[PDB]
Design a protein around this ligand. Structure first.
Ligand SMILES: *CC(=O)N1CCN(Cc2cc(O)cc(Cl)c2)CC1
Ligand SMILES: *CC(=O)N1CCN(Cc2cc(O)cc(Cl)c2)CC1
Lengths: 304, 304
């Protein structure tokens, strides 16, 4: 028992982290096979950040300008190209520590682990979610760009995020491993609107199921609701509307606990309308929304 | 910016995890050099758990009874011994993935990362603290025993915890890597009292400093207090008494933010007496106490 915000073991990703330097700029890269992936803003100076012409800036750069170091050994750059907002640096050596991997573009509401790195060296690992407004609430300082978000299925690492930017609001923006930003964000120092950060309803419900499984049951009530009645409450509190797909995905948790999805929705409705009244659920005084139904099942069953 | 419950990169520890089987029991072991460390309750059957005579049970076990597997390869057991509540299985092969390591017995209030494992395979990593009542609030299912807690200083892994037990209250107990339990707990299926779980005052204050650094400043007030005045409030709310050593350890955070330790104590005093009033601090609606002053400095500076 016990329920924690748990990240994937980071070993398979640590072995892929390299340091990329271009001119006077240093950030992290991801070394998979004979390719190093990094944010294209590595070619920028602080002067050209208001509106950089990445194509024009990259013309002035040659293979020998990209200094790639894995630990204390230098990788030889034999090719370079820009794919959307990422640079792909072809090196002469395949990473011997390359795990089985995939590049995946996650859906808002899905979770992933982040291995925060600086100068190609890992500092820590934490679990987070792609918010409905396509931002992430991470922990990234200067030099952390190029740090990646990933998921692990048995032995396969699915890379889903690469860190590129911090908005003036302290939230984070970045791309998938094809260089496409999540959301409307651009790799430019400009006014960028982070939209309404809505709560991931299906994840909150999954976390309520995890709470019941691990003993916290104070919030269970004698009530039920309908999808349409619940969604009127969810709209009022900036929660994502709950769909039948969401009810279906909560099916295994409903089967395990014997608590119908709509009964759990009525518990959530009362929690939204009345608050926790000074009580806690799984050590939290607020409704947690960064655990998917898959995460709850995984943690409650012990999948390795 | 941004502040997260961050665990150490787990790679150095993943490479040490093995599966240990004795008779019909399977749990995790830690392979360092030519020694495998695991909870001694691996020699127990469910029948002998109310009051096991570990010395008598171990007499019936020979080297060939301890099946140790690293991935899919079998380690040859050439020696076995019991040190307190851990078994040390001498193998014929030094772990090639042994990092630089130390065995340390942590103080209550200190934090560490846990690499939850099952059948010698890592499932996830999370950050936690040794509570003042010597328990940890982890996430451990059947088969997770032998999973370790550790800290990392640059390249050296300081192992501090080995998981052994779950109390009927859902909290966790275990030992250091010499086999000595933290707290009064015994590896026996008996009524074991988890004492008063007090809040780690110095950690809450460090987290308040992290909040100010990362923008959350609503809780700052026009007041100050004294150590003795603050401690009257801390006693009332089951907080650990704050000592001058604690004030000294918060010194670098006080220097960085320009907020004197006693002024931050008055902010904490008002938060204790009045609550958050429906507001949050670093995405939390309760006062967080599992970040040491060292953790805050590390995360706010980017130490790898
Ligand atoms: C994440 C990181 O290491 N960095 C982000 C800040 N710098 C790059 C940058 C600057 C800027 O004004 C806008 C954008 Cl999109 C990126 C340094 C690297
Ligand atoms: C953590 C884990 O894998 N296990 C804990 C529960 N079993 C061992 C056990 C049983 C018991 O009644 C008391 C104690 Cl101290 C340990 C299985 C292994």
């Amino acid at each position: 028992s016990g329920f924690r915000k748990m990240a994937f073991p980071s070993g398979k990703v640590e072995g892929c982290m390299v340091q990329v330097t271009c001119g006077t700029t240093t950030l992290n890269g991801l070394w998979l096979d004979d390719v190093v992936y990094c944010p294209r803003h590595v070619i920028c100076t602080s002067e050209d950040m208001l509106n950089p012409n990445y194509e024009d800036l990259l013309i002035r750069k040659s293979n020998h300008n990209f200094l790639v170091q894995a630990g204390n050994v230098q990788l030889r750059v034999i090719g370079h190209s820009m794919q959307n907002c990422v640079l792909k640096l072809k090196v002469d050596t395949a990473n011997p520590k390359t795990p089985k991997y995939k590049f995946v573009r996650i859906q808002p509401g899905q979770t992933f682990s982040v291995l925060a790195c600086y100068n190609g060296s890992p500092s820590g690992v934490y679990q987070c979610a792609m918010r409905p407004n396509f931002t992430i609430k991470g922990s990234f300082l200067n030099g952390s760009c190029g740090s990646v978000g990933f998921n692990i299925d048995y032995d396969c690492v699915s890379f889903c995020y690469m860190h590129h930017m911090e908005l003036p609001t302290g939230v984070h923006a970045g791309t998938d491993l094809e260089g496409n930003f999540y959301g409307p964000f651009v790799d430019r120092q400009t006014a960028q609107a982070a939209g309404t950060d809505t709560t991931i309803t299906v994840n909150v419900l999954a976390w309520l199921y995890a709470a019941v499984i691990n003993g916290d049951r104070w919030f269970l009530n004698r009530f039920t609701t309908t999808l349409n009645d619940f969604n009127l409450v969810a709209m009022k509190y900036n929660y994502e509307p709950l769909t039948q797909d969401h009810v279906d995905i909560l099916g295994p948790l409903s089967a395990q606990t014997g608590i119908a999805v709509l009964d759990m929705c009525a518990s959530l409705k009362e929690l939204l309308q009345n608050g926790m009244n000074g009580r806690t659920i799984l050590g939290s005084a607020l409704l947690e929304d960064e655990f998917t139904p898959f995460d709850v099942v995984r943690q409650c069953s012990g999948v390795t």
